[PDB]
Amino acid sequence: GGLTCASAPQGTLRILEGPQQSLSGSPLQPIPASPPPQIPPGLRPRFCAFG
Amino acid sequence: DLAPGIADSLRHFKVLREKRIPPWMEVVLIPMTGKPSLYPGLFLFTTPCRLVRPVQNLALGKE
Secondary structure, three states, rough: OOOOOOOOOOOOOOOOOOOOOOOOOOOOOOOOOOOOOOOOOOOOOOOOOOO | OOHHHHHHHHHHHHHHOOOOOOOOOOOEEEEOOOOOOOOOEEEEEEOOOOOOOOOOOOOOOOO
């Protein structure tokens, strides 16, 4: 009436919960790159010679 | 063969602030080859004195 060893298991199942990968879009930056410093339009000379 | 996917899943949790993974856990996975490289294994630090720095996470754009 006691507990005895039974037949060895024939296989093992290991369960884990996993989600999946999306598409590669690689959206690097809101406003991207190093935007260049640049000329103010027209500007004009702010200096003249004497005479 | 589950270490890479686990590291990527844990990195996605910290970036999107899911689960309770602190926004600053370091999921490290030092791969193992046959070469005398650094000892292999998946570490996960969350202690209060490490240095961290921001980087734009591509493929998610989530800093």
